[PDB]
Amino acid sequence: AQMTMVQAITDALRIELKNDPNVLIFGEDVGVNGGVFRATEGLQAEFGEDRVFDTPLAESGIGGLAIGLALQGFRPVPEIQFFGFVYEVMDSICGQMARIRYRTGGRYHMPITIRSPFGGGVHTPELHSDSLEGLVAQQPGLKVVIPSTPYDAKGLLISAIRDNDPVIFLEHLKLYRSFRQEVPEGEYTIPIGKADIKREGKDITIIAYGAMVHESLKAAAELEKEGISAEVVDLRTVQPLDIETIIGSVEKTGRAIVVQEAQRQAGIAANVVAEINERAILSLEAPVLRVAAPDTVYPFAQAESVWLPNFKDVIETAKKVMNF
Amino acid sequence: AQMTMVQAITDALRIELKNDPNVLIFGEDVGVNGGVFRATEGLQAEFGEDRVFDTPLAESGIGGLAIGLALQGFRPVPEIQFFGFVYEVMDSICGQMARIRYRTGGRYHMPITIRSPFGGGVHTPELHSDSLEGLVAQQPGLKVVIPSTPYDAKGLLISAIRDNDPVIFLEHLKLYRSFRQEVPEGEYTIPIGKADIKREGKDITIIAYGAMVHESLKAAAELEKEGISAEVVDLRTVQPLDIETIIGSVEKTGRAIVVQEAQRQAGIAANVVAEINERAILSLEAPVLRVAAPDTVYPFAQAESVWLPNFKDVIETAKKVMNF
Amino acid sequence: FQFPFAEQLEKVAEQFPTFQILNEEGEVVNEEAMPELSDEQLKELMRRMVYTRILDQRSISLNRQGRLGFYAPTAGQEASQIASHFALEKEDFILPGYRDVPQIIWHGLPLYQAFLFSRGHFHGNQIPEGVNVLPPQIIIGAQYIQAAGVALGLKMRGKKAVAITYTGDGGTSQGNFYQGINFAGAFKAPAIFVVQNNRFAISTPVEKQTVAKTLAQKAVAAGIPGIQVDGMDPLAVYAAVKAARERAINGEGPTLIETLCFRYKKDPLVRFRKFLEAKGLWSEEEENNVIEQAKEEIKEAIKKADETPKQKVTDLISIMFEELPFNLKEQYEIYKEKES
Amino acid sequence: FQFPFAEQLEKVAEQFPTFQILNEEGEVVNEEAMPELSDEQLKELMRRMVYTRILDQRSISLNRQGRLGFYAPTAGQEASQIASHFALEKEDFILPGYRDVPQIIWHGLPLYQAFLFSRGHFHGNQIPEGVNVLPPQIIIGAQYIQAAGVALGLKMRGKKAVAITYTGDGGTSQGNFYQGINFAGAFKAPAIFVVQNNRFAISTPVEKQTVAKTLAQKAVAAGIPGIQVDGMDPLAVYAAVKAARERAINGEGPTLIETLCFRYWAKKDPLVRFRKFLEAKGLWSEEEENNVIEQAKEEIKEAIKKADETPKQKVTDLISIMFEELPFNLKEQYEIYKEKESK
Amino acid sequence: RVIAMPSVRKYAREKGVDIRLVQGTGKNGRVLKEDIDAFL
Ligand SMILES: Cc1ncc(C[n+]2csc(CCOP(=O)(O)OP(=O)(O)O)c2C)c(N)n1
Ligand SMILES: Cc1ncc(C[n+]2csc(CCOP(=O)(O)OP(=O)(O)O)c2C)c(N)n1
Ligand SMILES: [Mg+2]
């Protein structure tokens, strides 16, 4: 069926609740209200206040709650209202849940999925839109997943929920309802840690994730008008990296750029570049360059359009690489 | 005077307390106790309980205390007892103090230096030795400083305390009393953002910070006997990186490796590697390789010696680069 | 044997009765606690509350028209916001939450800068010198631990001022709310802590936040006093903040004040109008004058906001550090070229 | 017009007087509150406390010799740690702090695994199934929010059981301490929160933590019952925890218990008063004491040998316990370290 | 001071070609791969 990304997430959450009585969804305003973005709309009404429930206003407490619930044999799917609010709950995600299997030598484990919206282009207030995936990607025992399409969002979320270790599932706000796509009904999974080619190409590899995938697909169409053939790789999981798909693409084309919305000192672009340098430097006709935001705090709302990386930045840096 | 790093830090701190009536020092057990590692020893006795004081046991509180105090003219130098406890302090540092100048259009500012011990090799309990510099280095509006010698430690700290924006000063536990070195008496400064060559060489650049600088120097010495002249760059500041010094050296040698104590997915090595790929790939004879800890949680104390990167991993990796 | 747990709960509840001076009819139900205010102070308080109501109506309108951005409505909270600000002096430092723009306007932030905050412009946060406020705090609870430090800093310099901060009923669930009041209490620092309780945090009833029967009792965990006040009563709210300000300058430490309000007969304007009219201190034409004054000022401020030049990336870079790091030096140049 | 602030602080603090059944001499100063313990239960509680004292003395000694690593001394806290545990059932789940090793040992953690924890070996944290505990928590306050979730887990499964957790006087200053009790209160969850107050956090007196006259009163912020007890009194500690447990398992929510203790005044020792109380009842003798003592020393010596005989950790071990199935980076690194080990 | 991408420097080395000797036809003097072949 033709679904938006938010509908495919709701559909994945509905499927998991039916399939597994241990699945629980909870957070600020996710129950009766159905979510600040309607992501959990209809779920409490269908499944009950014992499956889908609200919490006090405290990010830190939600993480701890998810941990205790997992110790009691549940499969928690908590929500953090905006990811800019992760600072509050860093200990429980990174200091606790990511470490419990290791800390207990496999005796206990944390089948937890943290859903959190992030991202810009909609003029949100302060600390709503920040890209903080770079922070959680540095923590051993986490996996970090960022879909860009309705179809990827559903298969990756079902995968994320069934995974018996913690998974951060970051949901870009601009992509919730931005477009529709055919998404099969019922359950399917997509592997975690697995990229895909969204556009096949032969001249330059454009590696992207989140809202920057669409921007790279838009850049690639403009480049094709000038006879420059770009291969767009959607990472899908930002940790761990699909090394095989990234290197295979770079070996074919000989040139590469990495695209992120996050500030240049943040995000995960440096990791991707480093991995390329390490494994395929002999294929490189040119250095691997990065599209990224300026190294400032996330912009005051009115300044978003000039600050955020877009398809034009991608076009420009791609050409810089072609003309190196 | 011959000083240990902890002594050079204490000397830095006395000199700034004497020079600047606004300098405050606070944290858990920093007053009458003189600090868990003696780094503030004698300071409250000499300067008063109103300049050097204990706080309640709450790291987040400490961060917010430093912000308030800085809004009221003081130049706060708080301490977070071990850096593994930064998780609970991330909003005040990264979400708040890093952002106040930007957020107030320069109307207010944050002349704060956060002092925090970290690092391995001394069999500390859980979450005491974690290398978390990679996280703070991703935040716009912070500078991140990691000294490896008593001399560096003192100049960088005076600079750090003079800086009118937030600085994270990370103090490696193993390095606190591991070596003695002639550090000047009286005041001097080293610029933040400036690396230095600790050993000149011509065959391979080894870039390092923290405890890994010694491991690197020790490796350079074993490599000389094999006819490999390795140049050792101690970053000193990991955000901002000293691009000129790093690039100059790789341009001279044509080969590099980056050495860090943190897990491979953490630290700042991938940043360094991406910078080199971007600015000096035409000089590269081989991929820039990384020496780093395994991507696990920090080792249970007894596993430290087999887990932590040391001079022998540096040697093996450098030789891998030489034989490429 | 049974521990007297029910008794304990009842005993603590008895310590937190709702403080009220004016009822919904504008009649004085507590003469003993009536604060000493001149007839002109009483008229000014009503002017500012009426002004604030109109500011809310116009801001809601302007947001719907796309003329403002983020806006958190304040109608119904005028007593809690305005009468509490009234008990302060210019020396006092305010740390507002996202919804507490009125308090900082009256403390001297120009209206047009308040509108530039809403729209998302750095200039709206460029507070004037001598105006002791921060930009509204979007992270819930962060202002509470920051207020403890401001208060401490006030006490350290010997100044006769307080720090005052505001949060909602939802914010009392944060760890930082607790740390803010416990740090201030431990340091006997001069801070006033206001919790504005409208019973819902977004969709969430206060009953989902906590089993505590008042929020004011959360003060007990810090060792400091709490007062629960009728937040729809300008005199009760005035008298509580004034008592807390006195207590704080007299080095007795902080206070937690819970105001019980409703955001949109219980209307603070309703009962205050009746209070004043009974004393021949308020008339329809004085009220209609403030309304016009407001609309004119809001219109002017909206235009002054409109004439503020757009932000450039270079501007954003410039305000990051006093001295720019290598990376931001490089990027300034890249964006300067871009902007040329 | 003064608000009655002074009165409010007093009247509230007055709701939290120190609960005590045994004074320093072993005299019953509160007989109505006397818990129902058999002769054998009273002996068993004493055997456990004596054994725990020996464990502290031997652990300090072994740590000095370098045969233990991290060790946080317990002497003096035997009533608070051991009597509170005694009130528990095996269905109950314990979330200890770094100092609360004795509680998890008595709940069923083998002693040699407690010692492996101290040295820094993952097997020490490999809790036997059915022993409902977590390894000791290093992050002060983290155990409090986790317990709120455990208790909610227990309530959702309809288990007649509780979660219990312990922190120090310092740890009451943390945000998560407050969030744990407030979440448990909000959900009416079967949680017992213990605060062990010995007046110092490293070098910081309680008076530098808070100006609150009790730590028990912090319960008021959550709207839940709070109790302050003499933590050198085995019978008071037991009685308060048993009462918190019964309220919890009967679905009335959590309780905060503050224990007043002192760590090694020699008169105050929980062993001193409990020995007198039991001897004056003819239920304790020097022989029984020396049988416990020698048993402890034998078992400790056997535990330390068993720990010594645990194979040394390898990096491959540390990688394999990270995830159920390894992510690509760890598959790679596992092969690298397998080769390194090979050797 | 020579400038040449890794794949070239390596193509040179394994084929016993000193890059400092080889005249580069690529941009700003860059030693290209078919220049190593042209020298050879
Ligand atoms: C730490 C944090 N978590 C969540 C939010 C999102 N949020 C914004 S307003 C709000 C409701 C707050 O309710 P309340 O404290 O009662 O204040 P009110 O808005 O009613 O005035 C929430 C959860 C935030 N801004 N900060
Ligand atoms: C969050 C955190 N902060 C600081 C520390 C370091 N630390 C260990 S023990 C201690 C004193 C704690 O005292 P208390 O809470 O009273 O418990 P006690 O050890 O006295 O039983 C501190 C500050 C830690 N482990 N975790
Ligand atoms: Mg509210």
Ligand SMILES: [Mg+2]
């Ligand atoms: Mg203590």
